[PDB]
Amino acid sequence: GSHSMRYFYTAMSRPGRGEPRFIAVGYVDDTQFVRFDSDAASPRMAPRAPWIEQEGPEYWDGETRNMKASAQTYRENLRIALRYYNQSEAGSHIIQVMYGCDVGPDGRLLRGHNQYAYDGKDYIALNEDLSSWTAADTAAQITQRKWEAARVAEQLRAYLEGLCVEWLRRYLENGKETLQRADPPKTHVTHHPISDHEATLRCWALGFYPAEITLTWQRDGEDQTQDTELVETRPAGDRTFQKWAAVVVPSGEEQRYTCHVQHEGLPKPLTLRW
Amino acid sequence: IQRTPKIQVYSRHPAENGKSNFLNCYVSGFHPSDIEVDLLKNGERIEKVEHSDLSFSKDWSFYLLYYTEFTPTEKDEYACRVNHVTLSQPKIVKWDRDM
Amino acid sequence: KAFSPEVIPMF
Numbered sequence: 001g002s003h004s005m006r007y008f009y010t011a012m013s014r015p016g017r018g019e020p021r022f023i024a025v026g027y028v029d030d031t032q033f034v035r036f037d038s039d040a041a042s043p044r045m046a047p048r049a050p051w052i053e054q055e056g057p058e059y060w061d062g063e064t065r066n067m068k069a070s071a072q073t074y075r076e077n078l079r080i081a082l083r084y085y086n087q088s089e090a091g092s093h094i095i096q097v098m099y100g101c102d103v104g105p106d107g108r109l110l111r112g113h114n115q116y117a118y119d120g121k122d123y124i125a126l127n128e129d130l131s132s133w134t135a136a137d138t139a140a141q142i143t144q145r146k147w148e149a150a151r152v153a154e155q156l157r158a159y160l161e162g163l164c165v166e167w168l169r170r171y172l173e174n175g176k177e178t179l180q181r182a183d184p185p186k187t188h189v190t191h192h193p194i195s196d197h198e199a200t201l202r203c204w205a206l207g208f209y210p211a212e213i214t215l216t217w218q219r220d221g222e223d224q225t226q227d228t229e230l231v232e233t234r235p236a237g238d239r240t241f242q243k244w245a246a247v248v249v250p251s252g253e254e255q256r257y258t259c260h261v262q263h264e265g266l267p268k269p270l271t272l273r274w
Numbered sequence: 275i276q277r278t279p280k281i282q283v284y285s286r287h288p289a290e291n292g293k294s295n296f297l298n299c300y301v302s303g304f305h306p307s308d309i310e311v312d313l314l315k316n317g318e319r320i321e322k323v324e325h326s327d328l329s330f331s332k333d334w335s336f337y338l339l340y341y342t343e344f345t346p347t348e349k350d351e352y353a354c355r356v357n358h359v360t361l362s363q364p365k366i367v368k369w370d371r372d373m
Numbered sequence: 374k375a376f377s378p379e380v381i382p383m384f
Contacts, residue, residue: 007375008329010336012307023328026375035327045375048327059374066377073381080384094306096334099376117334120277120305143384152382159376167374192372202372206288231373234300235326235339236286244373 001110003029003179005168006100011074013093020078022071027100028171028179030210031239036067043068051175081118084139093119099126099156101164107172112160130157183209183240184265189274194248201274202246203259207236214262215245221258277335278360279304281367283353289346289371297344297369299354302337310357311340314366316350346371 006027013020019038024045026034033049045063047053077095087093099114114126124133124140124147131153135144147153172179185205192200203215211233217224229246236242249257254274261270280303286296299313307328313320326339344352352369 010307010328010330024375025327025329027329032327032329037327062377063375066375069381070375073383077384084384092306096330098330120275120334122334146384147382150380150382155378155382156376159378163374164376190372231282232280232300232302234282234284234298237296237298237339237341238286242284 001102002105002107003168003172004100004102005164005171006098006113009070009074009095009097011071011078011095013075013078013091015090015092020071020075022067022074024067024070028168028175030241031175031179033171033175034063036064038067038071049175049178051171051178054174081139084142085118095123096120099160101160101168103165103168107165107169109161109165112157112164114156114160126153126156130160178239181209182263182265183207185213185243185261185263187259187261187270187272189259189272191254191274193251197251198248199251199254200246201249201254201257201259202244203261203272205243205261205263207238207240207242208263208265209240210264211241212264213241213243214260215243216260217245217247218258218260219247219249220256224257276360277303277305279309279356279358279365281354281356281365282373283367283369284373285344285346285369285371286341291347292345294343294345296341297346297352299340299356299367300337301340301356302331303335304337304358304360305335306359307336308359309336309338310364311338312355313340313342314351314353314355315344317353320344 009024011020011022022038024036033052034045036045045067096117101112102110104110112130116123122136124135124143133144135141185208188204190202217228233241233243259272279301282300284298313323320342323342330336353366355364355366357364
């Protein structure tokens with residue numbers, strides 16, 4: 001996988017507090033580039049990356065039109081879902097959608113995606129064939145039947161093989177300075193005594209892009225998988241990410257431990273010691 | 275079936291007392307999406323706090339970054355306070371400059 | 374650019 005484009009929609013009902021909220025975000029790789037929020041004073045598809053700003057008003061109007069229409073449709077989907085699960089109109093529920101395309105270094109489609117969740121649980125997904133569906137439950141089977149009847153998969157396929165890949169390629173070119181630049185992690189090991197007998201070694205990775213990274217501690221060359229505390233990769237707020245991995249070690253055994261760092265921005269994996 | 279937020283509180287750059295920086299509170303792994311997040315300076319709510327646009331992970335759980343400019347010192351204490359349906363009371367996570 | 378079907382699929 002060289003690059004991806006993904007759109008994420010969340011539709012959230014809130015009975016008694018107006019119509020369900022609809023929020024959409026678009027990403028290329030780990031870079032957000034657009035958003036829409038139906039609760040905004042003036043809802044529009046709005047830029048979130050500099051390289052998208054150059055798109056003309058027909059782009060922005062068209063995306064806004066789409067997001068408004070999408071909000072209406074997902075409000076209706078929330079109503080339908082209530083019926084499919086025999087649920088009360090008094091509770092709050094959420095539909096999420098993810099879709100997009102992955103392309104190789106040559107820009108050809110590697111694979112397409114279109115998945116839905118209801119209340120945080122898988123609902124229905126387009127299969128890798130971009131032709132058939134996997135329904136999670138008997139409610140989603142009803143949708144599957146309707147979508148098989150309407151040849152919905154063919155529509156997604158046409159988008160995923162066509163416009164998705166074409167627009168992704170455009171974005172990758174317009175944003176080439178950043179979207180096509182890996183920033184390797186800045187790495188170091190810190191040492192924190194806990195007692196006379198043990199200390200924590202923490203291996204840091206900072207300022208990296210994209211988010212994908214592997215940090216592993218070895219003791220005498222053996223992966224310490226079960227004994228390593230690994231925090232979730234976290235955004236720094238400047239486009240880059242941070243992560244650490246820690247192990248508790250016997251005092252005076254520090255040199256038996258090595259931190260190993262793999263990242264796409266590194267020509268070779270790194271080995272660090274305290 | 276609901277999922278409680280993971281919380282990390284940290285700075286954009288390594289902290290250096292008296293040098294301006296950004297204080298982050300990353301909340302993740304939660305469901306449903308409504309969440310209340312405050313950043314605190316010496317127990318008090320910081321007013322100027324922004325957050326990222328609602329997004330979610332492959333497992334459908336949501337994530338948000340809350341953040342504000344700050345100039346850390348030796349004695350000033352920072353924290354992130356989070357409330358969510360899954361929590362009986364707000365959770366407070368103190369900023370530790372080494373984590 | 375977002376997916377924009379003539380008819381947006383309903384559940």
